[PDB]
Design an enzyme around this catalytic site. Sequence first.
Site, short mmCIF file in Angstrom:
data_model
loop_
_atom_site.label_atom_id
_atom_site.label_comp_id
_atom_site.label_asym_id
_atom_site.label_seq_id
_atom_site.Cartn_x
_atom_site.Cartn_y
_atom_site.Cartn_z
N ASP A 1 0.84 -1.19 0.00
CA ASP A 1 0.00 0.00 0.00
C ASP A 1 0.88 1.24 0.00
O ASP A 1 1.63 1.47 0.95
CB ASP A 1 -0.92 -0.02 1.22
CG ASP A 1 -2.08 0.95 1.11
OD1 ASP A 1 -3.06 0.62 0.42
OD2 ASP A 1 -2.01 2.03 1.72
N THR B 1 -3.41 5.10 -4.44
CA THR B 1 -2.45 5.84 -3.63
C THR B 1 -1.03 5.80 -4.19
O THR B 1 -0.24 6.70 -3.87
CB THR B 1 -2.46 5.29 -2.21
OG1 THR B 1 -2.15 3.89 -2.25
CG2 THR B 1 -3.83 5.46 -1.60
N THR B 2 -0.69 4.80 -4.98
CA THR B 2 0.63 4.73 -5.60
C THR B 2 0.65 5.44 -6.94
O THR B 2 1.59 6.19 -7.25
CB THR B 2 1.08 3.28 -5.76
OG1 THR B 2 0.85 2.56 -4.54
CG2 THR B 2 2.54 3.21 -6.11
N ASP C 1 -8.56 -1.89 0.78
CA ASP C 1 -8.53 -1.34 -0.57
C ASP C 1 -9.65 -1.93 -1.42
O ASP C 1 -10.36 -1.21 -2.14
CB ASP C 1 -7.18 -1.60 -1.24
CG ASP C 1 -6.09 -0.64 -0.78
OD1 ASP C 1 -6.39 0.30 -0.02
OD2 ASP C 1 -4.93 -0.83 -1.20
N1 ADP Z 1 -4.87 -7.44 -13.61
C1 ADP Z 1 -4.37 -6.28 -14.09
N2 ADP Z 1 -3.98 -6.16 -15.38
C2 ADP Z 1 -3.49 -5.01 -15.87
N3 ADP Z 1 -3.33 -3.90 -15.13
C3 ADP Z 1 -3.67 -3.88 -13.83
C4 ADP Z 1 -4.22 -5.10 -13.22
N4 ADP Z 1 -4.46 -4.80 -11.93
C5 ADP Z 1 -4.11 -3.51 -11.73
N5 ADP Z 1 -3.63 -2.97 -12.86
C6 ADP Z 1 -3.14 -1.58 -13.04
O1 ADP Z 1 -2.16 -1.24 -12.06
C7 ADP Z 1 -2.36 0.09 -11.58
C8 ADP Z 1 -2.06 0.14 -10.09
O2 ADP Z 1 -2.64 -0.94 -9.38
P1 ADP Z 1 -2.28 -1.12 -7.82
O3 ADP Z 1 -0.80 -0.88 -7.66
O4 ADP Z 1 -2.82 -2.45 -7.37
O5 ADP Z 1 -3.12 0.03 -7.07
P2 ADP Z 1 -2.44 1.36 -6.49
O6 ADP Z 1 -1.93 2.10 -7.68
O7 ADP Z 1 -3.57 2.03 -5.78
O8 ADP Z 1 -1.40 0.83 -5.53
C9 ADP Z 1 -3.81 0.41 -11.89
O9 ADP Z 1 -3.86 1.69 -12.51
C10 ADP Z 1 -4.30 -0.63 -12.87
O10 ADP Z 1 -4.59 0.00 -14.11
MG MG Z 2 -4.84 -0.70 -5.82
#
Ligand code: ADP
Ligand code: MG
Lengths: 540, 536, 106, 525, 60
Positions: free
Chosen positions: B56, B89-90, B393
Amino acid sequence: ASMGTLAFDEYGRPFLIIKDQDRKSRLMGLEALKSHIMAAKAVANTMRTSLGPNGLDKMMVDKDGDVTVTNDGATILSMMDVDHQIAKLMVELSKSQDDEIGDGTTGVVVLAGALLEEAEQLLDRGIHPIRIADGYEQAARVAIEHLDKISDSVLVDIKDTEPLIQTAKTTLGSKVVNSCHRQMAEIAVNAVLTVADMERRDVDFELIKVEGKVGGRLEDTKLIKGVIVDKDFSHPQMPKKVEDAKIAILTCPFEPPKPKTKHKLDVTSVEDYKALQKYEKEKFEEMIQQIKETGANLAICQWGFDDEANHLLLQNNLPAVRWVGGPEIELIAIATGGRIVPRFSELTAEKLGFAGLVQEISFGTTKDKMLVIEQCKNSRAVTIFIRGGNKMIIEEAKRSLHDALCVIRNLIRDNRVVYGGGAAEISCALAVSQEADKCPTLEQYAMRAFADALEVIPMALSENSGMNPIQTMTEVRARQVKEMNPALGIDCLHKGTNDMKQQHVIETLIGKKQQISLATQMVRMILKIDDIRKPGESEE
Amino acid sequence: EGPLSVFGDRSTGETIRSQNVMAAASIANIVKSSLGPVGLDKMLVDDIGDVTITNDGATILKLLEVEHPAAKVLCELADLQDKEVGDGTTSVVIIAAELLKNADELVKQKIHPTSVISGYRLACKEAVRYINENLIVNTDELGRDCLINAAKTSMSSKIIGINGDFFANMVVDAVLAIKYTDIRGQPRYPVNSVNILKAHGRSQMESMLISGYALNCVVGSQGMPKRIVNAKIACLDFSLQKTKMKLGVQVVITDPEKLDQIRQRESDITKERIQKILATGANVILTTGGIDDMCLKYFVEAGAMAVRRVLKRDLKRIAKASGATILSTLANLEGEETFEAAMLGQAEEVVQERICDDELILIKNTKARTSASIILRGANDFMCDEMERSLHDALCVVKRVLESKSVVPGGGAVEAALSIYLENYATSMGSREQLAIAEFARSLLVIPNTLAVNAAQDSTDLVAKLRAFHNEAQVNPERKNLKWIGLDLSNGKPRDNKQAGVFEPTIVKVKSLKFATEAAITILRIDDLIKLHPES
Amino acid sequence: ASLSLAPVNIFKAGADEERAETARLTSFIGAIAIGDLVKSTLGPKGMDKILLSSGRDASLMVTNDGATILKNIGVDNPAAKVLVDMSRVQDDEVGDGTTSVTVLAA
Amino acid sequence: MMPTPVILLKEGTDSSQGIPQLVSNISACQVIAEAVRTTLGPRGMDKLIVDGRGKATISNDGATILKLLDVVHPAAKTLVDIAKSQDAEVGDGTTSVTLLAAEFLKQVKPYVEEGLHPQIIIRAFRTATQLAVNKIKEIAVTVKKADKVEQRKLLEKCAMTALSSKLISQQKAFFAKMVVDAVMMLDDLLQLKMIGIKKVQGGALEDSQLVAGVAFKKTFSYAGFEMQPKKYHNPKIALLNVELELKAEKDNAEIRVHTVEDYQAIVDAEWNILYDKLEKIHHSGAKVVLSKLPIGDVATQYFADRDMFCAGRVPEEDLKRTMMACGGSIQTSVNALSADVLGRCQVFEETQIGGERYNFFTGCPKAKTCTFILRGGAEQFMEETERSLHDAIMIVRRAIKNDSVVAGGGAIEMELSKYLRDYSRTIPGKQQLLIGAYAKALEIIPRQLCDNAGFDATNILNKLRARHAQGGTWYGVDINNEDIADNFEAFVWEPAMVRINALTAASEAACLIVSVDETIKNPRS
Amino acid sequence: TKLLQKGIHPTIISESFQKALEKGIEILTDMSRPVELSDRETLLNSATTSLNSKVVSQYS
Ligand SMILES: Nc1ncnc2c1ncn2[C@@H]1O[C@H](COP(=O)(O)OP(=O)(O)O)[C@@H](O)[C@H]1O
Ligand SMILES: [Mg+2]
Ligand SMILES: Nc1ncnc2c1ncn2[C@@H]1O[C@H](COP(=O)(O)OP(=O)(O)O)[C@@H](O)[C@H]1O
Ligand SMILES: Nc1ncnc2c1ncn2[C@@H]1O[C@H](COP(=O)(O)OP(=O)(O)O)[C@@H](O)[C@H]1O
Ligand SMILES: Nc1ncnc2c1ncn2[C@@H]1O[C@H](COP(=O)(O)OP(=O)(O)O)[C@@H](O)[C@H]1O
Ligand SMILES: [Mg+2]
Ligand SMILES: [Mg+2]
Ligand SMILES: [Mg+2]
């Protein structure tokens, strides 16, 4: 603000680029220029109070506590313990003016400081510092040509020394030795006239020996058309005066000969010993006989001699000096018309010099004696013997007379003369203002600034003399414009008239031109600097 | 220093801008490695051996010890995204840092920061509009599997990723359980009312969804029963202890014969209150206050289950879920003291359940509303905490999907489409704002770039293919179905993410863009810095 | 502005630059100190001074001669050094007047 | 990581590995470039650096500035090295090389950050470098007429260009004339040791001068030197490596005599040895005598009596210049002093130059040497003047050997950026981005010119891109007009080899820096 | 600074500054135009001008 590069890498790994980057400093851009300008302004505002007849002196104390009172900008900035690199540049500037000219060492610093002070406002208004430097170069060219234009010429002959005495008096007006003003100026003139290839050629100052001895009065300072030495006759019973002296100048010690190569003379018998003994005796007698046979009445050695030679000189009525230095031996030769002899066998009546008077001089309750050689026929060497009540005024008199000699030299090199009292600066400021009214708008601020900076010398002269700078300067500027007269300046001595051509206030054209050129070139190199990186360690 | 004489340091001009960009970049490089299904987790050791594993970004930037203000800004940005959305958040931190980077590049080229800021603002507005008009999918057209797909997308990159196939069901069920309708008949899904407990032990697959409530509490006395079936529940916000007279009341005896009776009331008063409660039929009594041993004995003899020091929020949730009324006092509008059976709540069972040498309370099948608890089960406390954060989340994402019924595709689809559209749109806006908008567009590409980089694949080739697909979609009206294309990071190939099930709530991307833009603008306005020496 | 009282100091660590009033202040107080030191030795009823040197020998002198007194004192004021050198030069030129010249200058 | 009982490397070994290490190298190079950026072009500024000793150096020369920076970064040392290499092979372009290398690195920083394999980048850099170099060789203007007036014009313009960035730009036409006059006198190797550069504090830049002959400062004269004359109107010059003074005939020599007559004979023998040397020197007809070794007081006075001039301890380089100018040979023995070995000039003089005394041999028509005498108000003023003249002189030499000129103000940079953009639009698409990045990087020279001048580099570079894409190859920045202009017609000329070597060195530095994937610092002993 | 350098007294500088101040108040008053508080457009424009300098100018 400083400390060079500070990032320490985005990732978090060490970022070391320069050695001791943490201990090092750096100033970049306009703030660096502003620091330079403040440093230069401080130096210039220090110096501007030592400008003109009513200028005051500064008392410098060295590391070991010796005191030096002076008005000479070069001497001040040399004795000044500066740590700011722009102050070092200003010290170099003044020293440069002294090297090339020998006068103006304080005007250059004041003028450069003023030019930078005006560049400060120009940078504030947003002009590129290089454009400022270029406008200053342009205005400097204008002022130099205008100096060539308003310049006057003086006669550098030996029959009419009045224009030269006037120039030298102007040079010595600002120094403590103006108590004997004309007496000092006259001898400076005569000195340079005695020692000079006057076909607009050089003046070698090695031919002018400037000697000082505490005691006496400044009024006792005089020109000896010959030489003074810090020695006395070798034997205390020799005579202290020699008239119509035939001089044998020798660089051979009156001692038995000695080869330069490693030598061993072997004594192997009583006869060898007695032969050595009589050889020594006969060498001493033969040396003295060779000195007598040439006809000399006085001997001058460079390397000292021993008891037998000294007594034989006394016995044979041959007054003699020993331990005379190479430079003094050279000056005695040049003055008396004699040739320096390396050995007695090479001594002849033609290699001798002639001096109409060789005297031993005392200095009261001192035990110190000096040797004067004078009344030579056409001595191409000369000495200025300075007297005074303390070593401070003696040393200041020495440097003041150096200024006067350099001025007379610059006249011998170029007879053209501009009129001082700030008049030349006001006229050049007017010329620069006129030419600025013609250039395109953007290099007009830089030429107007150059003019306003040229106007700092008259302001400084008036201020040091108690007058109101702006009032006096505006009045004399208006008079210069109305009645075309670039000889109108500041009445520092309050003689009533503003006409420097009437007050006999005279500067050398090369002097003023060099002031302007040096100030402008150094201001250019300073405005061109926009970054500094000192060690900054604060080390020991 | 020098002329100012301020007692501090001063950075000015390109220097301080470079510093700010370096700080933001540092913060973004901290978290870049934790983005997408191929992102990895981070350890954080708290200088004492306290360990925290997490993916996170908000958590990571909270635990860090940051000194630079331009980096504190991005930490606060991640915090704000975590408060207002719950996901992104990232991505928001990465995007803010990249906007700062490109904008500082423009300012070095001597484009005025005002112009860069105008262009960034315009590009943000138009990107929001373009998303809202072209890149949204209605979850109504998709049914319930849309929620499961959004939950799985949010859970990808977390320690409950591959098990998403099952965790999403729980997450979806949990939000559907806590659904409640308010005035205006609008459905509200108030997560943080789902209780989440952690208990190391059985595998993740053994994590439990409780239709009801789970309390990190136990009965007060070992003589009390530990299971009750037709649970009548009394929620009390006062303590059941020996009665103590208040501050302004003193007992002063002048006839010893009264002392005994006074002492007796100190306990009999409390007894009477408990009897009234038990007179209504209450078999379960939860209280936020304490319960003396004297009282616990009454509960024991009645066959009731008493629980003390329950938390106010747990009590509020049990009350709302079972139909009970939190009473701070047994006092009515008639100046007497009674307890009505209408103030009771009900539940089909209350049990004290064993979970890896630690007992909790389970209230199962509450009436008057459905509630939800989740017991996460992992190998140790670190994993369980990471599971809690991941599940939070996922719950927030499902809530956003249910409130606003619009989703957008994932895998860099939105960023690629916006890059294309904004690099085409900049041509109309000024000459320098054009450069600013083009740079905003290019900055948006840092998300698919980072996803591919983390997957250990050719970022350049993949993002170029993406932009080619999206340009084909935006210049050929017959191919708009290409909008839904994004990255497939398990194969390194673009893919129809609307058909693959990679959905993200529109609010996620919209708020990411808005917050990142404001943060970049805030940092991009600083051209000086005065760091004062500390007062001491 | 000024050389020392400027936003930037232009000097090496340990130097200093006394300006107009401060310079005349140090100069006058130093010279007048020297003068008040050497007077009271002036005239027939003048009294002597003790020159209790602090060296490893601790030389001891009793003098009414102004030149000797000024030579044998540790001076740090530059104007005082000027007056000291002046008395030395008086003693060199003639053998009397070193206290009269010192007092007169002061 | 964990702590091994016996660690592999020595404790204290700092190893930076991977993409972060590479990006950090690029950032360090950006720092080094920034340190010299503002010196670029006619509106460039000088830098003041101060050493631990407290001695300041003021320079516009990038190689000098980087030598003074105590750079320790292993990757940023490479920019310092390539600036040194530029000063070696060419003598100008030291700032341009650093700017170009750092901009190559800056431009590829994004692709490096996203995991692009550096080998691809170095391949692209090598390709684009070869292309740009061949294009410079192709479009460089080389007048094939060998006309002397046009070949002097070309050198004068190249020198004016090389000098239109320094503190002597306001006299650069002046100095350019001299620089050409200087290099057009050297024979065939164009040796810099054959050009003398004296710095006489005091005077203005226009007071500086070139002497078609030789000049050197007076050297520790003894007594009798002022008795010597100081001007000769057709002197013959004896150049010697001879100590003329009474000395031990040899250091391992020991005389042994047992008779006072032999003693006397030995004394007189030393004197006759010396006087014989002096008599040979006198009878050769030489009225001027120079010795690389001391000339004692006896010899000084001897020559003074014969109305000759003598100077001892003359430095070896000044002696070789006197030889190459006057036309003699240096003699360790005075036994064969023929007119063949004596030198000759039309005028010899000793004059005062700003506080110093200088001997001038002037009037040598067969002179393969010239001597610059530079005036100025500070040691560092004159030193930077010397550095500027060194830039101009090296430029003129390289131009003499290859009169192939291109235009400046970024004209060549914009043309190469155009050509490389065009080439990149014709290749698959991976090398396309990197060669386009090379092209965009080349734009740093006109951009930095406009920045240092105070313009809107963006608008000016747009104008240039347009005028270079419409047809037009020598259009670049016009500084005094804040605009663009045909710099080949404005006479902003620059030898092609300058930019050829700049691109070569910058590309090599970039390729090196980008190929490094790990840095391992061992602890210093 | 430059006035003092010219050799003018601070009292004269201050009084002459007061003179210039009175004249400048006169000049600015002459330049001004009256406004009625009902003129909402003038008020909106004054507020926008006040906000143009601040970070809240895209939200003006
Ligand atoms: N299964 C997936 N296939 C392709 N892209 C993904 C998938 N899951 C998440 N993403 C992409 O990764 C980005 C960041 O996801 P994540 O790191 O889990 O959330 P956060 O950015 O809040 O930490 C998102 O913008 C999403 O578009
Ligand atoms: Mg996420
Ligand atoms: N008698 C005088 N009357 C008017 N002005 C003078 C007089 N003597 C000197 N000046 C002026 O004072 C300035 C300073 O001269 P001085 O202090 O002697 O040497 P420096 O120029 O080295 O300071 C000169 O520019 C000159 O114009
Ligand atoms: N009998 C006398 N009556 C009046 N004055 C005297 C008499 N004897 C000496 N003096 C004065 O006393 C002074 C002695 O001064 P002295 O201490 O020698 O001064 P200094 O040390 O400066 O030479 C002389 O100036 C002289 O005028
Ligand atoms: N008059 C001019 N107009 C435009 N550009 C110029 C002019 N003179 C020199 N330049 C350019 O200035 C740049 C850098 O000059 P400088 O820094 O002195 O040389 P270098 O950095 O190559 O040693 C070169 O690209 C050169 O073409
Ligand atoms: Mg003077
Ligand atoms: Mg150059
Ligand atoms: Mg405002």
